[PDB]
Amino acid sequence: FERMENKVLDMEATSQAAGELAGFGIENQFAQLEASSGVEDELAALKA
Amino acid sequence: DPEKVLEQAVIDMQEDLVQLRQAVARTIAEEKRTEQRLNQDTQEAKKWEDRAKLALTNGEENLAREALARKKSLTDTAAAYQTQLAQQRTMSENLRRNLAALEAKISEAKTKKNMLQARAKAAKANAELQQTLGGLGTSSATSAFERMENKVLDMEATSQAAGELAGFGIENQFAQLEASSGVEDELAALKA
Numbered sequence: 641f642e643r644m645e646n647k648v649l650d651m652e653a654t655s656q657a658a659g660e661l662a663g664f665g666i667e668n669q670f671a672q673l674e675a676s677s678g679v680e681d682e683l684a685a686l687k688a
Numbered sequence: 689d690p691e692k693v694l695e696q697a698v699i700d701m702q703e704d705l706v707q708l709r710q711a712v713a714r715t716i717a718e719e720k721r722t723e724q725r726l727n728q729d730t731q732e733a734k735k736w737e738d739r740a741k742l743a744l745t746n747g748e749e750n751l752a753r754e755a756l757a758r759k760k761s762l763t764d765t766a767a768a769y770q771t772q773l774a775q776q777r778t779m780s781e782n783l784r785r786n787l788a789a790l791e792a793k794i795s796e797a798k799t800k801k802n803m804l805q806a807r808a809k810a811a812k813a814n815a816e817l818q819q820t821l822g823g824l825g826t827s828s829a830t831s832a833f834e835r836m837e838n839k840v841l842d843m844e845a846t847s848q849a850a851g852e853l854a855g856f857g858i859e860n861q862f863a864q865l866e867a868s869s870g871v872e873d874e875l876a877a878l879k880a
């Protein structure tokens with residue numbers, strides 16, 4: 641169980657490496673995606 | 689690996705419980721025997737006591753006292769065996785309670801490790817899925833699109849070479865062509 645537990649920490653360490661690099665300018669494009677999402681909500685209000 | 693060690697310990701636990709069962713069964717056998725032994729012994733004193741009663745009938749006080757000698761010997765043995773039986777009963781319950789507790793340890797220890805191992809394996813499997821989703825490699829095609837893009841620039845460069853040389857005196861002849869074109873327009877006005 642200790643042996644497997646170390647592997648879990650390795651995955652968490654990999655998650656740390658995976659998570660830290662995740663940050664990119666793409667986050668700005670998500671705001672555009674959410675901005676476009678409001679359009680359908682605005683159109684949804686038009687349907688209402 | 690802990691998987692093998694944990695599994696092996698679980699396998700070992702299977703052996704241990706069987707042995708304790710045998711020890712208990714051995715204990716059951718021992719207590720039964722002394723129970724059997726003491727029971728009959730208590731009666732033998734009564735039997736010899738009866739032999740004294742025959743002596744009580746007439747004369748042989750020696751036989752009566754002799755019978756008491758067996759009586760005294762037997763009762764002492766019964767007390768010793770009674771004491772021995774107490775030890776086995778106490779020991780038997782000790783192993784019984786030890787076995788009951790030992791069983792709980794084995795069951796929980798075995799199951800908890802297995803589920804821990806399963807979830808731990810599940811954990812890495814989920815993590816791998818997330819990693820692979822980020823690790824998608826189809827973006828490498830940009831080089832191919834980049835490769836074609838360079839060719840487009842080569843065509844534009846060829847267009848630059850083609851367009852720059854296009855200039856010639858022939859342009860003056862086009863004015864003559866357009867000048868002749870006006871003639872038909874002038875004739876078109878004549879038709880109008």
